Design a protein around this ligand. Structure first.
Ligand SMILES: Nc1ncnc2c1ncn2[C@@H]1O[C@H](COP(=O)(O)OP(=O)(O)O)[C@@H](O)[C@H]1O
Ligand SMILES: Nc1ncnc2c1ncn2[C@@H]1O[C@H](COP(=O)(O)OP(=O)(O)O)[C@@H](O)[C@H]1O
Ligand SMILES: CC(C)CC(=O)C(=O)O
Ligand SMILES: CC(C)CC(=O)C(=O)O
Ligand SMILES: [K+]
Ligand SMILES: [K+]
Ligand SMILES: [Mg+2]
Ligand SMILES: [Mg+2]
Lengths: 304, 304
């Protein structure tokens, strides 16, 4: 999958981009439909799963019904369709979580659901990146070409999600750990924010929850979460280290399972890992039981 | 393999211990000999490998020639033999490193040498622990039963090796990183020091070297190495985190190979990992290229 960095004045690059998207979306949607068609019958019969299955069929129908893009007029209407579909599918992760929660227990092969979700969610991420990139090409935001930030600061985007997670945490516990950021705090490079926008708040919420729940006696005084940025020519590494007591030995093999939670659907970790690996990186956990957890997010730098 | 914690007044436990050792050593030595007999011919013909092979045969001969232990008089002489053998074999790791260094290049299957060394070095560690434990049973050291410390402080033993590594480092570079220790600094529990005595200085030397070599402009002012102790009911975790620049992507798949070094034989990491895993734990590396490395040593608590 490619994100067109091309720019032009007649607006021809918008046409080429739209034509590529028009070519690409139906194919990738068809792959998701095949995934639904191959789900174990008893899972596929779940009304929420069926609802999502039908959304995808409906998406494929609308996309294939759209005439080949001939001019900017057509391209403009196609963008309307894509916006509609993006919105129609915005709750898909949540619907799948819900539909699978109970139903998947009716199945011996637990590998199956994991594979279906990894494949379905990462293909969806890719689909949404492509579509959103095309739409964003019409925008005149500085330092962006579509959804590509030409000079992303890891520190800045981390801070954005830190403020977000801290507010959620303060609402629930009356306080939140402070976050310190160190390492390559001045790094700036071309990068696509979207996956960080998913992953970072998931990891931050986990770290803050763990910290508060292990400090119930001193909610007014909890250990900082410490984030380290390492930027090299190959990848970006973001280490998130907390003193929230660690992931217990008895839970460790379970925490990367969809649905597993000690508490919201238990999707944060497996989804984040699937996204990271889909993009050529990884997500690794180091548990110091009794002390805390280090989470390492790695993402490959831009292929230009 | 079992370390007899039994104690008695007639000195009968020394007899039982000796009889067990007399039973156990020849068998385990015979296994090492089989390992030499199965080495690729061209490696087995290396004169240094042949020398080590012959040492093991000679060990097996002496052990099997020793009459069955009947009384404390016999047990005492057996201890003399064991002391001799421990001393005769003290340079074995170094001889194997040397004999294998070139010779192993004459071999397609690089898996072979790794397996031979993992197996040979860990079996040897076990053999030396057992023998040294028996000898130590004659000692009256407080807080020890043989080589088992009844109340080991991880902080204390870490500090011992910190002082050791720092002196080596200062000798070579004119300075050494300071080391801070945090987490469960007051932990005390029954534990066998011997494996830590191998592993800790290896990891500390790596961390200090990396730190000095990445700070050649400011040898008088280098970042601390930070060690975190986590003690729980399952394992002991010792995390050693440095700011020495990390292990490069191009080296990462090689650093756990025997002989691989960027500089002394390149044995520190693979040996430490083999020892940790032999004892039911592990050794894991997290590289933040451009920033530093976290090394996680885990060792299972005592099985009583
Ligand atoms: N930093 C952490 N410290 C301690 N436990 C954690 C941490 N991160 C995740 N976990 C554990 O992993 C489980 C799975 O996390 P996740 O997939 O994000 O789902 P959720 O947060 O919805 O439970 C959590 O319920 C929690 O028990
Ligand atoms: N903490 C560290 N930081 C950077 N590089 C490291 C670190 N630890 C190990 N290495 C790399 O791994 C290689 C292998 O280490 P090791 O097996 O201990 O052998 P040696 O120290 O003899 O080279 C080292 O040469 C070094 O390049
Ligand atoms: C292009 C849309 C159908 C978006 C999509 O695939 C999804 O979010 O599920
Ligand atoms: C008992 C000894 C022979 C010691 C040993 O096996 C060794 O160190 O190689
Ligand atoms: K989970
Ligand atoms: K090595
Ligand atoms: Mg979560
Ligand atoms: Mg070393």
């Amino acid at each position: 999958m490619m994100l067109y960095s091309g720019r032009s004045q007649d607006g021809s690059h918008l046409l080429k981009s739209g034509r590529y998207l028009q070519q690409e979306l139906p194919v990738r949607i068809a792959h998701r439909i095949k995934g639904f068609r191959s789900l174990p019958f008893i899972i596929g019969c779940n009304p929420t799963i069926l609802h999502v299955h039908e959304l995808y069929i409906r998406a494929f129908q609308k996309l294939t019904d759209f005439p080949p893009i001939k001019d900017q007029a057509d391209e403009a209407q196609y963008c309307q369709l894509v916006r509609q579909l993006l919105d129609d599918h915005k709750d898909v992760v949540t619907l799948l979580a819900e539909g699978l929660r109970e139903s998947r227990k009716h199945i011996e092969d637990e590998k199956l659901v994991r594979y279906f979700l990894d494949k379905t969610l990462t293909s969806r991420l890719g689909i949404r990146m492509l579509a959103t990139h095309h739409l964003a090409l019409h925008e005149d935001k500085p330092d962006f070409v579509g959804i590509i930030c030409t000079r992303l600061s890891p520190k800045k985007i981390i801070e954005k999600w830190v403020d977000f997670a801290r507010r959620l945490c303060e609402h629930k516990y009356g306080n939140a750990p402070r976050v310190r950021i160190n390492g390559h705090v001045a790094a700036r490079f071309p990068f696509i924010p979207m996956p960080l926008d998913y992953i970072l708040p998931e990891l931050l919420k986990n770290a803050m929850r763990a910290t508060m729940e292990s400090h119930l006696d001193t909610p007014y005084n909890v250990p900082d979460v410490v984030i380290t940025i390492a930027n090299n020519d190959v990848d970006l590494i973001i280490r998130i280290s907390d003193r929230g007591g660690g992931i217990a030995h008895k839970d460790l093999d379970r925490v990367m399972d969809y649905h597993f939670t000690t508490a919201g659907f238990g999707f944060g970790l497996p989804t984040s890992r699937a996204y990271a690996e889909y993009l050529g990186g990884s997500l690794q956990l180091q548990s110091l039981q009794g002390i805390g957890t280090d989470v390492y997010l790695r993402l490959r730098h831009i292929d230009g």
